Design a protein around this ligand. Structure first.
Ligand SMILES: NC(=O)c1ccc[n+]([C@@H]2O[C@H](COP(=O)([O-])OP(=O)(O)OC[C@H]3O[C@@H](n4cnc5c(N)ncnc54)[C@H](OP(=O)(O)O)[C@@H]3O)[C@@H](O)[C@H]2O)c1
Ligand code: SF4
Ligand code: SF4
Ligand code: SF4
Ligand code: SF4
Ligand code: SF4
Ligand code: FES
Ligand SMILES: [Zn+2]
Lengths: 256, 106, 111, 206, 176, 89, 147
């Protein structure tokens, strides 16, 4: 065990621990896009870029471990310069769907712009649009709304089993789709719509029905299939329509 | 001549000097180690010297009042009542009461 | 000794009694001066059922707070204020459901 | 900063001297916690003695506030002690604003401000109506912002916004207006709460 | 700054006392006050009779709610629940289902006139500019049921006011 | 389309053999003209040259935020979020 | 036959001619109700004369928010009115609370206390729109007594 200070305050952590994983113990959450709960640690966004006490270049929270007793500030001037800047890169090639978009409030990228993103102005000219990907019953996927990350790519190979999603191009023309026209298998791939931060993958049954506002959440155990328990069901006046997986320590691994 | 308030500005000098000399004696009965006596005295002694220096000019009224002598007299008239109430209810000299539950952040 | 409230545990019982006497004399006075409404005999029974619901007695703080609250809702006719026959009527008149039966309430479908 | 900052702090150093001046008296009976932020001063006071604190700030030579104009009360169930009576004070000769607070649960009676201030009694009636905080040695505690036959207190966070008795029909009775009907139109409970803390330094350690 | 309301006695001696006494003995200044409304009777009244003449207004004005549509058909409202959240009265209700195939625009759309304080908030919050407030005045009903607006329909029947709306919105883009 | 009762507008049933609806009898029920999206497909589809084209209702004056639509699928119609306007090539 | 049918319209012509309002100083709606007396938009001897007293007047205009403290007060005023009486609930508060509605004190829509014939929806009830509240009232009076 080795102690390392985060925002001057010292906190105890393991020898092999991530910077974002250690910051949570000190009650501080950094801006995230690539998960830390169950999905494998990967770069491919550089949003969680934080500056150390003595460093020429900023390091990512997911990649770089603590190792030695070094101070890292979360509310620093160098950390703010990155977070206000990277948001502008994410929205330079964003299709603009916020009213029409299936998510609205639930969207993680929507919230991060209000808290960390640069509000004053946005300079952009001509955003690239991607063709619609083939999907069967659950989760009507829009490739344009996707930010091109690595979250659902690793989810298909590790958590779901059979791989389907991957890289298709090189530049801005690169898509997160299956490339070959084939419907995704059920098993546990229904949780992929709840996995994605942006409004790219969202359930076809709950598409354009209710927003994040007005819908009241209530926790209830699942009746269909044993062992599965704790799932938030949105009321949204009289008849329920949206169902979401609630976090559990041992009952369910962040998937319904 | 007429004052701004309901209390009429009566032509009386040294009247303000009586009330300020009265309150100094009241303070030296119970509290001596307490800061209430030590801090109030230095304001009164500085104010009393200004009355002695100025011979019935409007500049004496302009010294930390600027609403004639009648408005300053009202502060001196209620000064004896507050000094007697501070001596009656023990708070300035004694400090031993309980503290509230640790919570403040909203 | 915090907090005082008004009286001790045993003294609080006789404070309600003192309030009861003043309000027991007002039910004949709230008919002739105000309005006919119902009845003098039925009005007195409406007083007794109000105190039976409040009857618990465990803390002097709870009992004494009911006295001050009682010295406003029952003081509404002491110094004679306007109620306009809509206020002061504690018992429901247009409300007729009193079902306490697993068999009775379930037939109406509730909860 | 051109549009970023509202005003620069310059009188804040002089206002901080007030927070030391009252604290130099040092009573456990009065002082407790002194907080000063954004050109203002806040003091919270022990429940046992509120009247001696109200006689202070009034009349005093160094600090002549006198006018105890505005009187508020906070409804919060997070603490062990529920309600919090907040006095807002203003000086006319000195030209400054100071705040006086209470910390007790105040379901049990609290000291009144009627002997100190003449208009405070009307504000004291507002607190007893909305919250249910009794003032000891208060002259005439009449109801203002409540109905003549109203049960409970209409502002408390423990009970709903619509109220228990609220709907008033004329119905079958010739003159008597009804009360017992309780159903109203649906107020949409917004379950919105944004992820990520908006502000640094406000975060508290568990 | 001090303006002072007190005159400190205008009368002093002989000439200043007698003229101040003359106005209190008889009238004079009351006859002067009588002549003030005499000239007011002579000048023309600024009065507008409603069934024929109409009063002054503005290019941006809010009355009864009406939702707009695109030049080549189609509902301009996209269904967000945005205007629902801004609404301080919560008079506007919105529930959405997919329209046959492709487009996803509205099913339930009620704006209650039992509430609504007329903010222009829903006119401003709308990204597609569906609810555009027209210069409406005439609304009078027998019952509450006739007063509150149904699922679009009557709100869609704002076509009789949409011709004025198109002229008013020309003053709205690049604001005033 | 109408069957026995009043005409349906934007997919709304009146009543099954008249049970619930009774108030709309003395007063005539409202109906919106061309509410079944008949005017949506009435507008002719525009031809494009570029791979992606930005959509607008009528410039910055009329309410339409800019959305880019990709026309490369060939089999798909290609329509924006706000409009039912279709684009080919 | 024809004289009887025209005599009923002659009695109804008196209500078409003039109706005296009640000065219900209930809220902000009452300020625009004072604008009916204001020259620019006038009903002053066009068909409206302000005089107050519920016993003399023909039409009562509920001008704003009503509470549970006001529900017994307004009810008997309507009862103090002569039997040919008309109630015009003007404003969103008069129609079911401006905001409120889901509040504890405010009675919803006036119709729970006193029945309403003509509704005016306007919060700040524009004097232009207010003029219908008296003109439509006169138009609604069509036929009384057949037999
Ligand atoms: N005396 C009692 O209290 C008593 C005792 C025993 C039984 N009952 C029973 O209880 C009932 C009490 O009712 P009620 O007498 O109180 O009613 P009511 O006052 O006579 O009212 C009946 C209404 O219906 C209308 N109406 C009736 N017949 C009509 C016709 N042929 N043409 C047009 N309009 C007509 C009338 O309108 P217009 O005025 O516009 O014509 C009237 O307003 C009676 O039916 C009786 O059988 C009463
Ligand atoms: S993905 Fe999020 S930010 Fe982007 S349009 Fe959809 S809701 Fe808005
Ligand atoms: S669909 Fe969502 S999870 Fe998958 S790559 Fe795109 S943004 Fe990431
Ligand atoms: S009126 Fe505008 S903001 Fe409201 S749901 Fe329709 S498109 Fe969205
Ligand atoms: S004008 Fe205001 S109160 Fe009326 S519908 Fe729009 S947002 Fe709601
Ligand atoms: S409807 Fe509007 S103007 Fe009229 S009383 Fe209510 S808030 Fe005031
Ligand atoms: S959130 Fe750390 S690399 Fe994406
Ligand atoms: Zn478009």
């Amino acid at each position: 065990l080795i102690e390392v200070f985060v925002d001057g305050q010292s906190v105890m952590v393991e020898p092999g621990t991530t910077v974002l994983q250690a910051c949570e113990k000190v009650g501080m959450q950094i801006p995230r896009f690539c998960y830390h709960e169950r999905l494998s640690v990967a770069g491919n966004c550089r949003m969680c870029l934080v500056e150390i006490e003595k460093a020429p270049k900023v390091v990512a929270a997911c990649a770089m471990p603590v190792m030695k007793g070094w101070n890292i500030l979360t509310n620093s001037e160098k950390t703010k310069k990155a977070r206000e800047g990277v948001m502008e890169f994410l929205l330079a090639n964003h299709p603009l769907d916020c009213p029409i978009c299936d998510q609205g409030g639930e969207c993680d990228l929507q919230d991060q712009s209000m808290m960390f993103g640069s509000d004053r102005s946005r300079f952009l000219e001509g955003k690239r649009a991607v063709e619609d990907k083939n999907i069967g019953p659950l989760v009507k996927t829009i490739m344009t709304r996707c930010i091109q990350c690595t979250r659902c790519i690793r989810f298909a190979s590790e958590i779901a089993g059979v791989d389907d999603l991957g890289t298709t191009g090189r530049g801005n023309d690169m898509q997160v789709g299956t490339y070959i026209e084939k419907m995704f298998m059920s098993e546990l791939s229904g949780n992929i719509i709840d996995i994605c931060p942006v409004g790219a993958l969202t359930x076809x049954x709950x598409x354009x029905x209710x927003x994040x506002x007005x819908x009241x959440x209530x926790x209830x155990x699942x009746x269909x299939x044993x062992x599965x328990x704790x799932x938030x069901x949105x009321x949204x006046x009289x008849x329920x329509x949206x169902x979401x997986x609630x976090x559990x320590x041992x009952x369910x691994x962040x998937x319904x | 001549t007429g004052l701004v308030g309901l209390a009429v500005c009566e032509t009386p000098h040294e009247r303000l000097k009586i009330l300020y000399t009265k309150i100094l004696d009241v303070l030296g009965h119970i509290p001596k180690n307490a800061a209430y006596r030590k801090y109030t005295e230095q304001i009164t002694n500085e104010k009393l010297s200004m009355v002695k220096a100025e011979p019935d000019v409007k500049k004496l009224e302009e010294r930390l009042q600027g609403g004639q002598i009648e408005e300053v007299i009202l502060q001196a008239e209620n000064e004896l009542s507050l000094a007697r109430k501070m001596i009656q209810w023990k708070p300035w000299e004694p400090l031993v009461e309980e503290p509230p539950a640790s919570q403040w952040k909203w | 000794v915090k907090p005082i409230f008004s009286r001790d545990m045993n003294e609080a019982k006789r404070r309600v009694r003192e309030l009861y006497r003043a309000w027991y004399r007002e039910v004949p006075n709230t008919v002739h001066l105000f309005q006919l409404d119902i009845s003098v005999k039925q009005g007195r029974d409406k007083v007794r059922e109000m105190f039976k619901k409040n009857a618990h007695i465990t803390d002097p703080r709870v009992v004494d707070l009911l006295v001050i609250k009682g010295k406003m809702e029952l003081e509404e006719t002491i110094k004679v204020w306007k109620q306009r026959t809509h206020v002061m009527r504690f018992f429901h008149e247009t409300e007729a459901p009193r079902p306490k039966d697993f068999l009775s309430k379930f037939y109406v479908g509730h909860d | 900063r051109p549009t970023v900052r509202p005003r620069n702090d310059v009188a804040h150093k002089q206002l901080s001297a007030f927070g030391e001046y009252v604290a130099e008296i040092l009573p456990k009976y009065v002082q407790q916690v002194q907080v000063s932020c954004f050109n203002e001063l806040e003091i919270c006071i022990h429940p046992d003695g509120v009247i001696p604190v109200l006689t202070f700030l009034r009349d005093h030579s160094n600090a002549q506030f006198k006018s105890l104009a505005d009187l508020t009360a906070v409804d919060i169930p997070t603490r062990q002690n529920r309600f919090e009576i907040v006095y807002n004070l203003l000086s006319l000769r000195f030209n400054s604003r100071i705040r006086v607070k209470t910390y007790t649960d105040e379901l049990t009676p609290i000291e009144s401000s009627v002997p100190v201030y003449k208009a405070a009694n009307w504000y004291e009636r507002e607190i007893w109506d909305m919250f249910g905080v009794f003032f000891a040695n208060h002259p005439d505690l009449r109801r203002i912002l409540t109905d003549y036959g109203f049960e409970g207190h209409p502002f408390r966070k423990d009970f709903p916004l619509s109220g228990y008795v609220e709907l008033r029909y004329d119905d079958e009775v010739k003159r008597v207006v009804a009360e017992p009907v309780e159903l109203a139109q649906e107020f949409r409970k917004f379950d919105l709460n944004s992820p990520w803390e908006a502000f640094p330094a406000y975060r508290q350690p568990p | 700054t001090y303006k002072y309301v007190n005159l400190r006695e205008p009368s002093m001696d002989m000439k200043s006392v007698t003229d101040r006494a003359a106005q209190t003995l008889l009238w004079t200044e009351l006859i002067r006050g009588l002549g003030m409304t005499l000239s007011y009777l002579f000048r023309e009244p600024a009065t507008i009779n409603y069934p024929f003449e109409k009063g002054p207004l503005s290019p941006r004005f809010r009355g009864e709610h009406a939702l707009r549509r695109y030049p080549s058909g189609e509902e301009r409202c996209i269904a967000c629940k945005l205007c629902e959240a801004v609404c301080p009265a919560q008079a506007i209700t919105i529930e959405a289902e997919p329209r046959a195939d492709g487009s996803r625009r509205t099913t339930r759309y009620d704006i209650d006139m039992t509430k609504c304080i007329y903010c222009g908030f829903c006119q401003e919050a709308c990204p597609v500019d569906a609810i555009v407030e027209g210069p409406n005045f005439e609304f009078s009903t027998e019952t509450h049921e006739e007063l509150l607006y149904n699922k679009e329909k009557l709100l869609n029947n704002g076509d009789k006011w949409e011709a004025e709306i198109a002229a008013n919105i020309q003053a709205d883009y690049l604001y005033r | 389309x109408x069957x026995x009762x009043x005409x349906x507008x934007x997919x709304x049933x009146x009543x099954x053999x008249x049970x619930x609806x009774x108030x709309x009898x003395x007063x005539x029920x409202x109906x919106x003209x061309x509410x079944x999206x008949x005017x949506x497909x009435x507008x002719x589809x525009x031809x494009x040259x570029x791979x992606x084209x930005x959509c607008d209702g009528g410039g910055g004056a009329l309410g339409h935020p800019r959305v880019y639509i990709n026309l490369d699928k060939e089999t798909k119609t290609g329509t924006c979020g706000y409009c039912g306007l279709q684009f080919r090539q | 036959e024809y004289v009887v049918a025209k005599l009923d319209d002659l009695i109804n012509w008196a209500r078409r001619s003039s109706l005296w309002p009640m000065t219900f100083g209930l809220a902000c709606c009452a300020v625009e109700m004072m604008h009916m007396a204001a020259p620019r938009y006038d009903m002053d001897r066009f068909g409206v004369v302000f005089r107050a007293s519920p016993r003399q007047s023909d039409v009562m205009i509920v001008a704003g928010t009503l509470t549970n403290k006001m529900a017994p007060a307004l009810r008997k005023v309507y009862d103090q009115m002569p039997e040919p009486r008309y109630v015009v609930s003007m404003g969103s508060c008069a129609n079911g609370g401006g905001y409120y509605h889901y509040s504890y004190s405010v009675v919803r829509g006036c119709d729970r206390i006193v029945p309403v014939d003509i509704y005016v929806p306007g919060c700040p009830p524009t004097a232009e729109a207010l003029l219908y509240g008296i003109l439509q009232l006169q138009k609604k009076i069509k036929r009384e007594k057949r037999l």
